[PDB]
Design a binder for this molecule. Structure first.
Ligand SMILES: OC[C@H]1O[C@@H](O)[C@H](O)[C@H](O)[C@@H]1O
Ligand SMILES: [Zn+2]
Length: 288
């Protein structure tokens, strides 16, 4: 096997496509051989565990990964840490209590500050709704995923500080476009006076926009996404989405690879009771 392996969520989402490119570019800068893989879809928890196990069973020196769920890679990651594989968690926080209970750790975790992402999206909505405020909803990612949970907490905490805002719904749409359209339809049905919906990612935000359109409410219901994927940036320019909190997956990926290579130079994996190296990549609100 090459020196390093990378496990991304799914290349069917531009966020992960850009993270692969960032890693590829960084690999050339560092001089390292990297094999980059991804599961076929967001719901492939089991096959991602198998993918991780297959790479962990090869002799890569390090494996950088973004788990599809907080817990689906706890067991294989613990196993890999025990084998002395230098592990870096990209983007989506593996459940660290669960991992410590399974006897492993990760050298580092590189991600966006996801609480700030949800606070930016909510703060923008609050601003746009102005003095009168109104009812708002959050369309979360997969419940329990650290990335979505942080965005949810950041947005919820911001909305709770603004009394003119009424959070009427907070539901998971599992990073899925179809599911988000369905969840937004139901939310719009139950609370037809809703004025804005923060979505924990662009894949979901796009489907939420279609629900809003079906309801004859485009522009009357703000829709804010997260990631800054190409189609969502286009929708934001065209008024189909109000805004998106853009991330820089290329730098998450490059920075994670660099942390992994750096860790390998130490010659031992991180101790179980040492906090992983932590690095945050900025986000930025993208509006019309
Ligand atoms: O794969 C779904 C999503 O996972 C999150 O952890 C990433 O930060 C991006 O929001 C991505 O779109
Ligand atoms: Zn080899």
């Amino acid at each position: 096997a090459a020196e390093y392996a990378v496990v991304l969520k799914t290349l069917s989402n531009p966020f992960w496509v850009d993270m692969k490119k960032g890693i590829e570019d960084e690999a050339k800068t560092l001089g390292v051989s990297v094999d980059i893989f991804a599961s076929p879809s967001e719901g492939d928890f089991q096959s991602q565990l198998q993918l991780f196990e297959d790479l962990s069973n090869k002799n890569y020196k390090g494996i950088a990964f973004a788990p599809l769920s907080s817990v689906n890679l706890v067991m294989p990651v613990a196993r890999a840490w025990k084998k002395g594989i230098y592990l870096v968690n990209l983007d989506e926080k593996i459940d660290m209590d669960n991992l410590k209970k399974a006897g492993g750790n990760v050298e580092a975790f590189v991600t966006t500050d996801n609480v700030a992402v949800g606070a930016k999206g909510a703060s923008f909505i609050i601003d746009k709704l102005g003095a009168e405020g109104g009812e708002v909803a959050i369309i979360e990612g997969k419940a329990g995923n650290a990335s979505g949970e942080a965005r949810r907490n950041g947005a919820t905490e911001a909305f709770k500080k603004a009394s003119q805002i009424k959070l009427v719904a907070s539901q998971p749409a599992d990073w899925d476009r179809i599911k988000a359209l369905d969840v937004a339809t139901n939310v719009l049905q139950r609370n037809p006076n809703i004025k804005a919906i923060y979505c924990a990612n662009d894949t979901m935000a796009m489907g939420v926009a279609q629900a809003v359109a079906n309801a004859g409410k485009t522009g009357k219901v703000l829709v804010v996404g997260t990631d800054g994927i190409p189609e969502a940036r286009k929708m934001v320019e065209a008024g189909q989405m109000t805004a998106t909190v853009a991330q820089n997956p290329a730098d998450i990926g490059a920075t994670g690879l660099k942390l992994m290579v750096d860790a390998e130079k130490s010659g031992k994996v991180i101790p179980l009771d040492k906090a992983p190296e932590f690095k945050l990549v900025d986000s930025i609100l993208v509006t019309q």
